[PDB]
Amino acid sequence: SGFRKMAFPSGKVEGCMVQVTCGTTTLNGLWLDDVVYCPRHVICTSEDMLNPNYEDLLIRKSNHNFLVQAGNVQLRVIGHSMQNCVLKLKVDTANPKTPKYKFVRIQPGQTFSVLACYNGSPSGVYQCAMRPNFTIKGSFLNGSCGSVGFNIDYDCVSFCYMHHMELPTGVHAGTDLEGNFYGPFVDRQTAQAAGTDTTITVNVLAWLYAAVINGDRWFLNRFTTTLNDFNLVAMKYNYEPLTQDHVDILGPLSAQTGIAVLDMCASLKELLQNGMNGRTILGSALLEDEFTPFDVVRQCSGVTF
Amino acid sequence: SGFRKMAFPSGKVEGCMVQVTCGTTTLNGLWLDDVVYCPRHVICTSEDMLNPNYEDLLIRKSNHNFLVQAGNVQLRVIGHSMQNCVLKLKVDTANPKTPKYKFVRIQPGQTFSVLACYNGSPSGVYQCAMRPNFTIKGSFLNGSCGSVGFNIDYDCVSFCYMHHMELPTGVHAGTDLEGNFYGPFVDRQTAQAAGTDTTITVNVLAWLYAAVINGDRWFLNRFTTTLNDFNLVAMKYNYEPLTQDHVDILGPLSAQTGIAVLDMCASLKELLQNGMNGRTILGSALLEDEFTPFDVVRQCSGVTF
Ligand SMILES: O=c1[nH]cc(-c2cc(-c3cc(Cl)cc(OCc4ccccc4)c3)c(=O)n(-c3cccnc3)c2)c(=O)[nH]1
Ligand SMILES: O=c1[nH]cc(-c2cc(-c3cc(Cl)cc(OCc4ccccc4)c3)c(=O)n(-c3cccnc3)c2)c(=O)[nH]1
């Protein structure tokens, strides 16, 4: 029992982190097989990032201008190319620690683990969610660019995120491992709106099921609702609309606890309309939306890797 | 910017986790050099744990009765001994992945990372605190015994915790790596009180400094206090007393933010007396005590490993 914001074990990713240097810029890269992936703004100076022409900046760069260091190991760069917003550096040595892996583009509302890195060295790991507006509320300092987010299924690392930018609002933006930004953002230091964020309704419900499984039951009430009525309330409190697809994903938690999804929606409705009245749920005084239904079943049933 | 409950990268510990089997009992062990450490109740049956005589139970066990498996690798057991509440199994092979390490006994209020494991396989990592009453509020299921807690300093893993028990209250108890329980607990399924817990005042203050560093400033007020007056309030709200030693550990955060420790105490006093009035601090609607001053400086300055 107990419920914690738990991250995937990071060892399989730690073995892939390298340092990438181009000119006077140093950041983090991801070394898989014989390719190193990193944000393309490694080729920019402080002035370039205000309005960069990456095509033109890269043309002034040759293979020997990229220094890639993996601990002591200096890697020899034998090719370079730009794919959307990431640079791909071909090296002459395959990473001996390459895990089984794939590149995935996650959906808004999905969670992943972040291995924050500086100068190629891992400093910490934490779990976060892709917001509905495609930002993430991370913990990143200067030098963290090229840190990656991932999930793990038994032995296969699914890389979903590479960190590129901190917006003036303090939230974070980045790409999938094909270099495509999540959300509307561009890798340029110029004004960019993230737009309205909402709460991930299906995750909140998943966490309420986790609370019930662990003994926190005070919020269960005598009411039910309909999907239509609930979505009226969701809209009023800037919650994402709940779909039948979401109801179905919640099916196994509903079965395990014997609480129909729509009954749990009614409990959530009453928490939104009346607040938590100075109480806590799973040690939290607000409604938590960073656990997916899969996360809750994983943590509450102890699946391993 | 941003502030997250961040855990140490777990790779160095993942390489040390093995499965230990004795009879029909299987749990987690820690393989360092040529020794495997695990809870001594691996030798108990379900009935034994109600009132075990570990000396007598171990006498019925021989080296070949302990099966130790590290992935595929079956380890050959050439010695066994009991040290307080842990078993030490001498194996004939040194773990090739042994990190630099030491065994440390932490103080109440200190934080560490937990690598939750099942059947020798890591499933997740999270950060927690040793409570003032020497329990931890973890996330552990049956089979998690022998999972370990640790800190990391550059390349040296300090192991501080091995998980042994879940109490009927749902909180968790365990030992240092010499087998000595934290707190009053014994490895026996019989009634055991944990006693009153308090909030870790110095950690709360550290987190308020983290909030200020990140831009959450609404809680700073026009008041100051004295150490004596603050400790009166702390006692009323079951906060740990603040000592001059604590004030000194907070010195660098005070210097960085220009906010005198006693001024921050006055802000904390007003939050305790008046509540948070429906506001949040660093995304939390309650006062958070699981970050030490060292944690806050580490996360806010990006030290790595
Ligand atoms: O050597 C290196 N140089 C640079 C970086 C670097 C670079 C950026 C960055 C990159 C681009 Cl292309 C545009 C941009 O715009 C911000 C903005 C957007 C919109 C409006 C105003 C400003 C920012 C950054 O955000 N961070 C950082 C800092 C703290 C936390 N997380 C990431 C680090 C690095 O890590 N290493
Ligand atoms: O094979 C295996 N067998 C057993 C275990 C095991 C064993 C215990 C345990 C061990 C002892 Cl000596 C005494 C005890 O008392 C509880 C109690 C104390 C006071 C009053 C009433 C009850 C419990 C346990 O707590 N957990 C567990 C379960 C869930 C989360 N975290 C840990 C697992 C295992 O992991 N693997």
XYZ file of C-alpha atoms and ligand atoms in Angstrom:
682
model
C 0.000 0.000 0.000
C 0.902 3.640 -0.365
C 0.914 5.640 -3.578
C 3.861 7.603 -4.918
C 4.689 9.591 -8.033
C 6.949 6.792 -9.268
C 9.366 6.965 -12.201
C 10.746 4.162 -14.337
C 14.171 2.838 -13.301
C 16.587 4.950 -15.310
C 19.648 2.703 -15.713
C 18.880 1.694 -19.302
C 18.751 5.375 -20.273
C 21.747 6.461 -18.168
C 23.952 4.326 -20.401
C 22.882 6.313 -23.472
C 23.589 9.868 -22.315
C 26.563 11.678 -23.849
C 27.800 15.256 -23.999
C 27.640 17.112 -27.320
C 29.749 20.190 -28.036
C 29.670 22.399 -31.132
C 31.611 25.630 -30.883
C 31.093 26.988 -27.369
C 27.704 25.310 -26.858
C 27.452 22.112 -24.801
C 24.321 20.060 -24.155
C 23.075 16.497 -23.798
C 22.795 13.860 -26.491
C 21.255 10.405 -26.767
C 23.574 7.666 -28.094
C 21.696 4.699 -29.598
C 23.404 2.152 -31.865
C 25.810 4.371 -33.882
C 23.688 7.558 -33.871
C 23.712 10.464 -31.399
C 20.533 12.564 -31.180
C 20.491 16.091 -29.733
C 18.625 19.397 -30.201
C 19.690 21.201 -33.326
C 20.187 24.443 -31.432
C 23.545 23.006 -30.269
C 24.805 24.821 -33.405
C 23.529 28.243 -32.269
C 25.231 31.016 -30.380
C 23.364 33.146 -27.853
C 22.680 35.652 -30.643
C 21.678 33.016 -33.230
C 18.775 31.749 -31.131
C 16.882 35.042 -31.408
C 16.271 34.339 -35.119
C 18.176 31.295 -36.416
C 18.410 29.980 -39.947
C 19.339 26.416 -39.018
C 19.932 25.385 -42.633
C 22.519 28.166 -43.025
C 24.075 27.633 -39.601
C 24.540 23.889 -40.197
C 26.208 24.440 -43.595
C 29.094 26.134 -41.773
C 29.581 22.972 -39.679
C 31.641 19.876 -40.529
C 31.835 16.473 -38.839
C 34.956 17.417 -36.873
C 33.188 20.475 -35.406
C 30.955 18.220 -33.269
C 32.654 16.797 -30.179
C 30.826 13.866 -28.582
C 32.038 12.546 -25.231
C 30.645 9.547 -23.338
C 32.464 9.626 -20.029
C 36.098 9.262 -21.004
C 35.136 7.910 -24.439
C 35.625 10.451 -27.213
C 33.393 9.430 -30.118
C 34.474 9.929 -33.719
C 31.819 11.732 -35.789
C 31.536 10.420 -39.350
C 28.264 11.987 -40.477
C 25.740 14.643 -39.544
C 22.210 15.439 -40.626
C 19.246 17.497 -39.518
C 15.819 15.889 -39.083
C 13.190 18.497 -38.206
C 14.510 19.994 -34.936
C 17.065 17.336 -33.965
C 20.587 16.726 -35.163
C 21.647 13.157 -35.915
C 25.382 12.520 -35.584
C 26.669 9.301 -37.111
C 29.569 7.962 -35.018
C 31.915 5.106 -35.867
C 31.150 3.108 -32.673
C 27.879 1.434 -31.697
C 26.876 2.149 -28.115
C 27.537 -1.166 -26.297
C 24.844 -0.206 -23.760
C 22.071 0.404 -26.302
C 18.859 -1.018 -24.793
C 16.000 -2.375 -26.807
C 14.186 0.778 -27.819
C 11.732 2.539 -30.060
C 10.751 6.133 -30.765
C 7.139 6.996 -29.902
C 5.068 10.163 -30.068
C 2.792 10.272 -27.040
C -0.602 11.748 -26.744
C -1.543 14.658 -24.477
C -2.362 13.361 -21.025
C 0.167 10.512 -21.154
C 2.923 10.324 -18.527
C 6.637 9.562 -18.824
C 9.856 9.634 -16.800
C 12.449 12.382 -17.309
C 16.147 11.798 -16.735
C 17.468 15.314 -16.199
C 21.076 15.558 -17.360
C 23.819 18.182 -17.366
C 27.006 17.989 -19.451
C 26.056 14.429 -20.371
C 25.722 13.268 -16.763
C 22.414 12.179 -15.179
C 21.371 14.244 -12.161
C 17.829 13.085 -11.312
C 14.723 11.262 -12.454
C 11.065 12.236 -12.052
C 7.641 11.442 -13.494
C 5.518 13.979 -15.365
C 2.640 14.330 -17.816
C 2.358 15.805 -21.277
C -0.097 18.632 -20.633
C -3.178 18.946 -22.879
C -1.520 22.049 -24.320
C 1.663 20.011 -25.079
C 3.933 21.616 -22.497
C 5.435 19.792 -19.539
C 5.880 21.161 -16.018
C 9.394 19.906 -15.483
C 12.402 20.821 -13.385
C 15.117 21.944 -15.828
C 18.025 24.405 -15.591
C 20.333 25.814 -18.246
C 22.350 22.941 -19.682
C 19.472 20.445 -19.460
C 18.665 20.537 -23.190
C 18.780 17.089 -24.752
C 17.537 15.365 -21.616
C 14.950 12.784 -22.646
C 11.634 11.399 -21.454
C 10.722 7.746 -21.728
C 8.533 4.825 -20.726
C 9.650 1.212 -20.257
C 7.820 -2.040 -21.069
C 9.737 -4.975 -19.558
C 13.006 -4.476 -21.463
C 12.090 -1.948 -24.203
C 12.658 1.787 -23.691
C 10.147 3.939 -25.573
C 11.710 7.369 -25.969
C 9.003 10.004 -26.283
C 10.541 13.366 -25.400
C 13.680 15.424 -25.888
C 13.919 18.688 -23.948
C 14.557 21.884 -25.979
C 13.197 25.041 -24.327
C 11.953 26.829 -21.244
C 9.252 29.368 -22.068
C 9.080 32.737 -20.245
C 6.216 31.282 -18.205
C 8.568 28.697 -16.727
C 7.049 25.661 -18.452
C 8.906 23.404 -20.866
C 8.701 22.427 -24.528
C 10.450 19.829 -26.642
C 10.206 17.268 -29.404
C 9.727 13.618 -30.087
C 12.878 11.808 -31.168
C 12.138 12.561 -34.840
C 12.545 16.250 -33.990
C 8.860 17.234 -34.236
C 7.795 19.639 -31.494
C 4.917 18.773 -29.255
C 2.488 21.652 -29.573
C 2.837 24.845 -31.596
C 6.390 25.712 -30.567
C 9.476 26.538 -32.649
C 13.112 26.428 -31.521
C 13.590 30.194 -31.560
C 13.762 32.738 -28.731
C 10.659 34.707 -29.679
C 7.214 35.197 -28.185
C 5.150 31.992 -28.234
C 1.850 31.280 -26.511
C 1.138 27.840 -25.060
C -2.600 28.437 -24.845
C -5.135 27.273 -22.312
C -4.302 24.183 -20.306
C -6.919 21.853 -18.872
C -6.943 19.106 -16.248
C -6.616 15.492 -17.475
C -10.005 14.166 -16.344
C -9.345 10.469 -17.001
C -6.122 10.602 -14.946
C -7.902 12.330 -12.040
C -10.497 9.534 -12.051
C -7.723 6.921 -12.208
C -6.136 8.482 -9.124
C -9.465 8.499 -7.274
C -9.615 4.751 -7.967
C -6.063 4.449 -6.614
C -7.226 6.294 -3.486
C -10.110 3.858 -3.000
C -7.801 0.854 -3.463
C -5.526 2.245 -0.734
C -8.263 3.075 1.793
C -8.940 6.785 1.149
C -12.723 6.558 0.701
C -14.202 9.681 2.315
C -15.017 11.239 -1.071
C -17.384 8.473 -2.247
C -20.957 9.764 -2.179
C -24.532 8.576 -2.733
C -24.929 10.168 -6.168
C -24.483 9.186 -9.768
C -24.375 11.210 -12.969
C -24.523 10.836 -16.735
C -21.621 11.326 -19.123
C -23.393 14.376 -20.573
C -24.093 15.947 -17.169
C -20.550 15.277 -15.981
C -19.053 16.850 -19.104
C -21.091 19.992 -18.390
C -19.356 20.229 -15.019
C -15.987 19.321 -16.540
C -16.264 22.203 -19.002
C -17.110 24.659 -16.195
C -13.945 23.704 -14.258
C -11.635 23.455 -17.328
C -11.392 19.675 -17.186
C -10.931 17.709 -20.396
C -14.159 16.120 -21.688
C -14.578 12.470 -20.750
C -15.229 10.141 -23.683
C -16.573 6.621 -23.865
C -13.012 5.594 -24.811
C -11.894 6.966 -21.437
C -14.707 5.118 -19.639
C -13.498 1.875 -21.234
C -9.857 2.423 -20.273
C -11.100 2.854 -16.680
C -12.935 -0.490 -16.926
C -10.430 -2.655 -15.014
C -10.236 -0.204 -12.087
C -14.043 -0.080 -12.039
C -14.130 -3.888 -11.981
C -11.506 -4.160 -9.227
C -13.182 -1.642 -6.920
C -16.792 -2.354 -7.843
C -17.363 1.375 -8.385
C -19.022 2.201 -11.695
C -17.161 4.862 -13.693
C -20.207 7.146 -13.673
C -20.522 6.855 -9.893
C -16.885 7.949 -9.608
C -17.641 10.836 -11.967
C -20.402 11.897 -9.551
C -17.903 11.885 -6.674
C -15.496 13.964 -8.762
C -18.310 16.380 -9.660
C -19.001 16.940 -5.958
C -15.307 17.577 -5.226
C -15.183 20.116 -8.033
C -18.354 21.870 -6.917
C -17.663 21.759 -3.164
C -13.859 21.495 -2.854
C -11.947 19.194 -0.524
C -13.124 20.941 2.690
C -9.634 20.870 4.203
C -9.153 17.132 3.668
C -6.529 15.195 1.737
C -6.557 12.318 -0.745
C -3.433 10.131 -0.931
C -1.503 12.874 0.862
C -2.624 15.600 -1.560
C -4.825 18.623 -0.954
C -5.672 19.048 -4.654
C -6.948 16.750 -7.393
C -3.974 14.993 -8.993
C -3.923 14.380 -12.762
C -0.419 12.935 -13.390
C -1.320 9.229 -13.080
C -2.815 7.413 -16.047
C -5.076 4.375 -15.550
C -2.170 2.206 -16.708
C 0.081 3.845 -14.102
C -2.397 3.124 -11.315
C -2.778 -0.551 -12.275
C 0.992 -0.885 -12.646
C 1.762 0.655 -9.255
C -1.112 -1.098 -7.474
C -0.173 -4.520 -8.963
C 3.639 -4.327 -8.950
C 4.553 -4.992 -12.579
C 8.315 -4.926 -13.075
C 11.019 -4.532 -15.735
C 12.950 26.479 -13.212
C 10.268 24.192 -11.878
C 10.512 21.998 -8.805
C 9.894 18.264 -8.732
C 10.144 15.455 -6.205
C 13.284 14.148 -7.908
C 15.007 10.825 -7.229
C 18.614 9.835 -7.808
C 19.315 8.020 -11.090
C 18.930 4.364 -10.186
C 21.191 2.562 -12.680
C 24.043 1.986 -10.225
C 21.612 0.253 -7.861
C 19.708 -1.664 -10.560
C 22.884 -3.622 -11.256
C 22.983 -4.871 -7.657
C 19.474 -6.295 -7.289
C 19.095 -10.078 -7.167
C 16.362 -12.518 -6.202
C 16.773 -14.565 -3.019
C 14.833 -17.771 -2.394
C 14.832 -19.920 0.745
C 12.195 -22.622 0.875
C 9.019 -21.169 -0.628
C 9.858 -17.551 0.249
C 11.241 -15.215 -2.424
C 12.321 -11.603 -1.954
C 14.923 -9.070 -3.048
C 18.608 -9.023 -2.208
C 21.468 -6.573 -2.651
C 24.616 -7.992 -4.300
C 27.771 -5.997 -3.491
C 31.268 -7.408 -4.057
C 30.799 -11.101 -3.096
C 28.065 -10.594 -0.462
C 24.274 -10.635 -0.884
C 22.230 -8.762 1.740
C 18.525 -9.439 2.332
C 15.990 -9.398 5.196
C 16.412 -12.332 7.512
C 12.715 -13.140 7.360
C 13.430 -14.801 3.980
C 13.862 -17.903 6.194
C 10.340 -17.676 7.670
C 7.107 -19.285 6.614
C 3.787 -17.470 6.911
C 3.328 -19.106 10.323
C 6.902 -18.426 11.510
C 6.517 -14.658 11.201
C 3.881 -14.505 13.943
C 6.564 -15.380 16.526
C 9.915 -16.332 14.962
C 13.048 -17.578 16.661
C 15.462 -16.558 13.912
C 18.437 -18.241 15.585
C 16.581 -21.578 15.579
C 15.129 -21.125 12.098
C 18.544 -20.331 10.582
C 20.181 -23.397 12.181
C 17.942 -25.582 10.007
C 19.324 -23.841 6.895
C 22.467 -24.703 4.913
C 24.260 -22.812 2.142
C 22.561 -24.837 -0.598
C 19.110 -23.926 0.776
C 19.550 -20.306 -0.385
C 19.024 -19.776 -4.113
C 20.353 -16.465 -5.439
C 19.558 -15.463 -9.018
C 20.800 -12.349 -10.828
C 18.936 -12.394 -14.112
C 20.040 -15.633 -15.716
C 23.067 -15.853 -13.406
C 22.648 -18.447 -10.670
C 25.015 -17.528 -7.838
C 26.773 -20.187 -5.783
C 26.335 -19.637 -2.028
C 29.449 -20.478 -0.008
C 28.613 -18.920 3.354
C 25.748 -17.477 5.355
C 25.494 -15.395 8.496
C 22.983 -13.289 10.368
C 23.806 -9.701 11.350
C 21.006 -8.178 13.429
C 17.980 -8.379 11.088
C 19.744 -9.005 7.765
C 21.170 -12.159 6.271
C 24.573 -11.985 4.593
C 25.147 -14.625 1.917
C 28.731 -15.112 0.792
C 28.797 -16.028 -2.914
C 31.763 -17.213 -4.957
C 31.479 -14.417 -7.581
C 32.052 -10.691 -7.088
C 29.325 -8.568 -8.640
C 31.003 -7.033 -11.731
C 28.571 -4.095 -11.478
C 29.367 -3.201 -7.860
C 29.431 0.616 -7.655
C 31.510 2.566 -5.217
C 29.418 2.384 -2.079
C 29.127 2.712 1.657
C 26.554 1.820 4.295
C 25.112 4.802 6.184
C 22.501 5.196 8.898
C 20.502 8.339 8.198
C 18.906 10.658 10.617
C 15.166 11.309 10.898
C 14.159 13.994 8.440
C 16.714 12.976 5.802
C 15.526 11.973 2.322
C 16.564 9.119 0.032
C 15.546 7.374 -3.189
C 13.784 3.994 -3.134
C 14.171 1.470 -5.931
C 11.095 -0.712 -5.512
C 11.812 -4.246 -6.705
C 9.870 -7.478 -7.135
C 11.451 -10.911 -7.645
C 14.810 -9.183 -8.036
C 13.634 -6.875 -10.822
C 13.377 -3.074 -10.466
C 9.879 -1.685 -11.013
C 10.090 2.007 -10.049
C 12.026 4.722 -8.269
C 10.758 7.493 -5.990
C 12.011 9.939 -3.366
C 10.897 9.864 0.267
C 11.843 10.982 3.769
C 12.638 9.118 6.952
C 9.806 10.313 9.185
C 10.649 11.700 12.649
C 9.079 8.531 14.043
C 11.386 6.393 11.813
C 8.736 5.077 9.438
C 8.599 5.863 5.737
C 5.473 6.533 3.675
C 6.415 4.398 0.715
C 4.655 2.534 -2.063
C 5.343 -1.178 -1.472
C 3.404 -4.375 -2.236
C 3.956 -7.960 -1.138
C 7.256 -9.130 -2.596
C 8.959 -5.742 -2.179
C 10.997 -6.770 0.881
C 14.709 -6.233 0.360
C 14.204 -3.179 -1.824
C 16.725 -0.548 -0.758
C 16.934 3.200 -0.260
C 19.996 5.217 -1.156
C 21.639 8.554 -1.860
C 24.373 9.238 -4.425
C 27.361 11.610 -4.243
C 28.993 11.845 -7.687
C 29.912 8.160 -8.061
C 29.390 6.725 -4.539
C 26.101 5.061 -3.570
C 25.280 5.443 0.126
C 22.831 2.687 1.005
C 20.694 3.736 3.955
C 17.557 1.591 3.943
C 16.379 -1.959 3.363
C 12.620 -2.546 3.339
C 11.250 -5.184 5.769
C 7.637 -4.559 6.823
C 4.314 -2.873 6.226
C 2.552 -2.017 9.480
C -1.252 -2.362 9.821
C -1.447 1.420 9.446
C -0.051 1.154 5.928
C 3.312 2.787 6.649
C 6.670 1.078 6.225
C 9.575 0.001 8.416
C 13.027 -1.358 7.699
C 16.693 -1.399 8.599
C 20.019 0.085 7.733
C 22.326 -2.256 5.842
C 23.798 -3.566 9.116
C 20.338 -4.933 9.928
C 19.437 -2.428 12.671
C 15.822 -1.274 12.476
C 15.032 2.382 12.233
C 12.719 3.111 15.133
C 11.326 0.711 17.724
C 10.262 -2.049 15.340
C 11.007 -5.789 15.336
C 10.683 -8.198 12.405
C 7.682 -10.045 13.817
C 3.987 -9.910 12.907
C 2.733 -8.564 16.227
C 1.238 -5.297 17.421
C 3.729 -2.416 17.238
C 3.086 1.295 17.660
C 4.987 3.830 15.562
C 4.128 6.729 17.850
C 3.433 10.351 17.076
C 4.830 11.744 13.855
C 5.714 15.393 13.365
C 6.418 17.622 10.371
C 10.084 18.199 9.424
C 10.277 21.955 10.033
C 13.703 22.546 8.465
C 12.617 20.787 5.247
C 9.409 22.853 5.057
C 11.510 26.024 5.336
C 13.907 24.705 2.678
C 10.955 24.181 0.337
C 9.645 27.693 1.012
C 13.079 28.943 -0.082
C 12.776 26.774 -3.203
C 9.384 28.393 -3.852
C 10.886 31.881 -3.586
C 13.747 30.952 -5.936
C 11.185 29.779 -8.510
C 8.861 32.799 -8.282
C 6.180 31.644 -5.810
C 6.372 34.602 -3.407
C 2.802 35.319 -2.273
C 3.450 33.889 1.204
C 6.219 36.349 2.161
C 4.893 38.784 4.759
C 5.940 41.894 6.690
C 6.617 40.090 9.972
C 9.533 38.515 11.742
C 9.757 36.238 14.762
C 12.238 34.837 17.259
C 13.420 31.241 17.423
C 11.669 30.870 20.791
C 8.371 32.341 19.564
C 8.461 30.247 16.398
C 9.098 27.051 18.359
C 5.998 27.818 20.442
C 3.964 27.807 17.233
C 5.809 24.750 15.917
C 4.882 22.784 19.034
C 1.203 23.770 18.690
C 1.065 22.423 15.106
C 3.203 19.288 15.754
C 6.204 20.600 13.847
C 9.694 19.562 14.906
C 11.517 22.218 16.962
C 13.906 24.369 14.952
C 17.456 24.494 16.307
C 20.329 26.851 15.658
C 21.949 23.937 13.783
C 18.951 23.995 11.433
C 19.218 27.780 11.020
C 22.857 27.335 9.977
C 22.097 24.596 7.447
C 19.578 27.026 5.901
C 22.312 29.687 5.659
C 23.125 29.327 1.940
C 19.450 29.525 0.909
C 19.067 32.587 3.141
C 22.118 34.141 1.470
C 20.915 33.332 -2.058
C 17.420 34.747 -1.550
C 18.293 37.542 0.863
C 15.544 36.338 3.212
C 16.685 35.906 6.804
C 15.810 32.495 8.266
C 13.741 34.101 11.029
C 11.762 36.137 8.498
C 10.952 32.894 6.674
C 9.928 31.360 10.002
C 7.480 34.261 10.421
C 5.986 33.508 6.998
C 5.672 29.837 7.946
C 4.046 30.799 11.261
C 1.395 32.780 9.378
C 0.700 29.863 7.014
C 0.278 27.551 9.983
C -2.005 29.945 11.835
C -4.047 31.084 8.818
C -3.760 28.236 6.281
C -3.118 28.594 2.561
C -6.480 30.300 1.818
C -7.068 28.163 -1.275
C -3.692 28.968 -2.839
C -0.824 26.727 -3.897
C 2.950 26.754 -3.455
C 5.041 24.976 -6.107
C 1.903 23.151 -7.242
C 1.022 21.947 -3.731
C -1.929 22.844 -1.533
C -0.183 21.734 1.677
C 3.187 22.440 3.276
C 5.741 19.992 1.868
C 8.430 18.521 4.145
C 10.201 15.954 1.903
C 12.968 18.240 0.576
C 16.064 18.838 2.672
C 18.090 22.055 2.303
C 20.717 20.016 0.449
C 18.023 18.714 -1.916
C 16.825 22.231 -2.702
C 20.339 23.523 -3.447
C 21.077 20.428 -5.530
C 17.909 20.711 -7.616
C 18.106 24.501 -7.940
C 21.810 24.391 -8.978
C 21.900 21.230 -11.115
C 24.608 19.140 -9.458
C 25.094 15.843 -11.273
C 26.499 12.324 -10.850
O 24.750 25.391 -24.474
C 23.482 25.573 -24.259
N 22.839 26.682 -24.794
C 21.485 26.864 -24.547
C 20.764 25.946 -23.774
C 19.283 26.264 -23.562
C 18.563 26.866 -24.614
C 17.210 27.183 -24.455
C 16.417 27.824 -25.595
C 16.656 27.407 -26.915
C 15.951 27.987 -27.980
Cl 16.271 27.493 -29.669
C 15.000 28.980 -27.717
C 14.755 29.394 -26.402
O 13.792 30.384 -26.173
C 13.317 30.594 -24.868
C 12.229 31.636 -25.085
C 11.065 31.286 -25.784
C 10.062 32.238 -26.011
C 10.228 33.551 -25.563
C 11.394 33.911 -24.880
C 12.382 32.949 -24.642
C 15.462 28.812 -25.345
C 16.654 26.896 -23.203
O 15.325 27.210 -23.017
N 17.365 26.321 -22.166
C 16.770 25.992 -20.890
C 17.053 26.741 -19.749
C 16.459 26.368 -18.538
C 15.611 25.256 -18.479
N 15.335 24.503 -19.622
C 15.922 24.879 -20.837
C 18.707 25.988 -22.315
C 21.434 24.829 -23.230
O 20.857 23.931 -22.486
N 22.783 24.658 -23.488
O 8.210 -14.133 0.369
C 7.852 -13.079 1.039
N 7.221 -13.217 2.269
C 6.840 -12.079 2.966
C 7.087 -10.802 2.450
C 6.607 -9.628 3.306
C 6.681 -9.738 4.710
C 6.241 -8.692 5.526
C 6.331 -8.797 7.050
C 7.452 -9.414 7.630
C 7.552 -9.535 9.023
Cl 8.955 -10.352 9.775
C 6.530 -9.028 9.834
C 5.415 -8.406 9.260
O 4.414 -7.903 10.100
C 3.454 -7.021 9.576
C 2.662 -6.633 10.816
C 3.274 -5.864 11.816
C 2.566 -5.515 12.974
C 1.252 -5.954 13.151
C 0.641 -6.737 12.166
C 1.350 -7.065 11.004
C 5.320 -8.290 7.870
C 5.711 -7.578 4.866
O 5.259 -6.538 5.649
N 5.623 -7.477 3.491
C 5.108 -6.305 2.818
C 3.857 -6.317 2.204
C 3.416 -5.158 1.555
C 4.229 -4.018 1.517
N 5.484 -4.010 2.126
C 5.924 -5.167 2.782
C 6.069 -8.505 2.666
C 7.723 -10.677 1.196
O 7.981 -9.537 0.626
N 8.101 -11.820 0.515
